[PDB]
């Protein structure tokens, strides 16, 4: 299963730079073109470059000329992209791709990563639970308030409880971001049995776990 | 530079539906259109490669047709799977270029949400802070409306929400809402009410609570 595990580092003050990884393994690393591509949230997926892993090759956009760079790497196997005076416009997702000689199409995508150019100090997620209020199915939830940057992990029951979940896309406020996720249970199941949402957010490494109880 | 449209940007269909996803180019392109698809979560695999007609290991429900300036891509039984955006590229001229996208979504039964109104949490109060969650879920159309009413009054300030992409098990969306206050003005009310307003009730689903029930 050829594939590209991506994710470089997702956040670096506005004005410095940044080497978002490309991992290609699932074929001969050297043998065909890498590919970068980029998608900000206002949903345009701009090409940027190509770089051949054998020769050193390349062809930039003549837009992010000089806004990137592309690196080599034969020996791990692992595309390059720096990407220097940052500001909030990189701030974006960024994808490497595969292109298949003969054809110019990009046939296997990594994952691609989410930059984050900003100078805003990282922030632990407060977790407070949502517990039904007014005393089948019940909803409850985690509310995840104030934590920066992107993003977080929010699961229930350590990943065994997956379905009638709802997890809402951040919204950040002033600095901050603010998310929330919901969970529906047959009545039976809560609280006649444990519930808890676990959220995880790297940026501050903070792992936690709050379980909803009865009555707020 | 080659621009790449696609017409429109957002469709709507039933299941079982055969769609066409058209796709235009600055110029004769040889043959050089390549389609993609990007489900939500920013999963994306190639669809066709070379002008459309060829595959590479994917369904055989997707085909597209084209020459010079136009091609499309084409999905032909629509499966409660398809729903995401599709590309369309360029691999000829430099720099290499993608078209606008098309949302494609698939229209079920009108439904109402489930609504659920939650008050501020032991543990946030303790630190000065008062936020009212509502959920909305499992509504279509996405087109619905939400309003808060603190004792009987007014929203507009401290409330924001936030959408989902549209569900792949239940083409159905659901709808997040946040009212926030200082704790100390939570605390200066006793009513709390999340009115929803959809187009399934010719009355607003309400949800609300009061402080000292609780």
């Given at each position: 299963?050829?594939?590209?595990?991506?994710?470089?580092?997702?956040?670096?003050?506005?004005?410095?730079?940044?080497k978002?990884?490309c991992?290609?393994?699932?074929?001969?690393?050297?043998?065909?073109?890498?590919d970068?591509?980029?998608?900000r949230?206002?949903?345009?997926?701009?090409?940027?470059?190509?770089?051949?892993?054998?020769?050193?090759s390349?062809?930039?956009?003549?837009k992010?000329?000089?806004?990137?760079?592309?690196?080599?790497?034969?020996?791990?196997?692992?595309?390059?992209?720096?990407?220097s005076?940052?500001?909030?416009?990189?701030?974006?997702?960024?994808?490497?791709?595969?292109?298949?000689?003969?054809?110019?199409?990009?046939?296997?995508?990594?994952?691609?990563?989410?930059?984050?150019?900003?100078?805003?100090?990282?922030?632990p997620?407060?977790?407070?639970?949502?517990?039904?209020?007014?005393?089948?199915?019940?909803?409850?939830?985690?509310?995840?308030?104030?934590?920066?940057?992107?993003?977080?992990?929010?699961?229930?029951?350590?990943?065994?409880?997956?379905?009638?979940?709802?997890?809402?896309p951040?919204?950040?406020?002033?600095?901050?971001?603010?998310?929330?996720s919901?969970?529906?249970?047959?009545?039976?199941?809560?609280?006649?049995?444990?519930?808890?949402?676990?959220?995880?957010?790297?940026?501050?490494?903070?792992?936690?776990?709050?379980?909803?109880?009865?009555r707020? | 530079?080659?621009?790449?449209?696609?017409?429109?940007?957002?469709?709507?269909?039933?299941?079982?539906?055969?769609?066409?996803?058209?796709?235009?180019?600055?110029?004769?392109?040889?043959?050089?259109?390549?389609?993609?698809?990007?489900?939500?979560?920013?999963?994306?695999?190639?669809?066709?490669?070379?002008?459309?007609?060829?595959?590479?290991?994917?369904?055989?429900?997707?085909?597209?047709?084209?020459?010079?300036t136009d091609?499309?891509?084409?999905?032909?039984?629509?499966?409660?799977?398809?729903?995401?955006?599709?590309?369309?590229?360029?691999?000829?001229?430099?720099?290499?270029?993608?078209?606008?996208?098309?949302?494609?979504?698939?229209?079920?039964?009108?439904?109402?949400?489930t609504?659920?109104?939650?008050?501020?949490?032991?543990?946030?109060?303790?630190?000065?802070?008062?936020?009212?969650?509502?959920?909305?879920?499992?509504?279509?159309?996405?087109?619905?409306?939400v309003?808060?009413?603190?004792?009987?009054?007014?929203?507009?300030?401290?409330?924001?929400?936030?959408?989902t992409?549209?569900?792949?098990?239940?083409?159905?969306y659901?709808?997040?809402?946040?009212?926030?206050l200082?704790?100390?003005?939570?605390?200066?009310?006793?009513?709390?009410?999340?009115?929803?307003?959809?187009?399934?009730?010719?009355?607003?689903?309400?949800?609300?609570?009061?402080?000292?029930?609780?």
């Open positions: 299963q050829a594939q590209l595990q991506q994710s470089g580092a997702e956040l670096m003050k506005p004005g410095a730079s940044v978002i990884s991992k290609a393994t699932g074929y001969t690393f050297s043998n065909y073109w890498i970068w591509i980029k998608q949230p206002g949903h345009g997926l701009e090409w940027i470059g190509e770089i051949l892993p054998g020769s050193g390349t062809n930039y956009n003549e992010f000329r000089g806004k990137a760079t592309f690196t080599a790497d034969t020996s791990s196997n692992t595309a390059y992209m720096q990407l005076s940052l500001t909030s416009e990189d701030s974006a997702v960024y994808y490497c791709t595969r292109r298949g000689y003969w054809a110019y199409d990009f046939d296997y995508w990594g994952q691609g990563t989410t930059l984050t150019v900003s100078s805003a100090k990282t922030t997620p407060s977790v407070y639970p949502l517990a039904p209020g007014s005393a089948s199915m019940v909803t409850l939830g985690c509310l995840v308030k104030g934590y920066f940057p992107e993003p977080v992990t929010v699961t229930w029951n350590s990943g065994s409880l997956s379905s009638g979940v709802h997890t809402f951040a919204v950040l406020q002033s600095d901050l971001y603010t998310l929330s919901s969970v529906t249970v047959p009545s039976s199941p809560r609280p006649s049995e444990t519930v808890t949402c676990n959220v995880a957010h790297p940026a501050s490494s903070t792992k936690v776990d709050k379980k909803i109880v009865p707020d | 530079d080659i621009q790449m449209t696609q017409t429109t940007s957002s469709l709507s269909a039933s299941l079982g539906d055969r769609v066409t996803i058209s796709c235009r180019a600055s110029q004769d392109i040889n043959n050089y259109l390549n389609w993609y698809q990007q489900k939500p979560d920013g999963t994306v695999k190639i669809l066709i490669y070379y002008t459309s007609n060829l595959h590479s290991g994917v369904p055989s429900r997707f085909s597209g047709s084209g020459s010079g091609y499309s891509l084409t999905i032909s039984n629509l499966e409660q799977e398809d729903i995401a955006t599709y590309f369309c590229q360029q691999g000829n001229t430099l720099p290499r270029t993608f078209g606008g996208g098309t949302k494609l979504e698939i229209k079920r039964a009108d439904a109402a949400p609504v659920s109104i939650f008050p501020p949490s032991s543990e946030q109060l303790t630190s000065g802070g008062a936020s009212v969650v509502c959920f909305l879920n499992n509504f279509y159309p996405k087109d619905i409306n309003k808060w009413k603190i004792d009987g009054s007014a929203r507009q300030n401290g409330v924001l929400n936030s959408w992409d549209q569900d792949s098990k239940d083409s159905t659901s709808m997040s809402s946040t009212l926030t200082t704790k100390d003005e939570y605390e200066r009310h006793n009513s709390y009410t999340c009115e929803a307003t959809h187009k399934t009730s010719t009355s607003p689903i309400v949800k609300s609570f009061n402080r000292n029930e609780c």
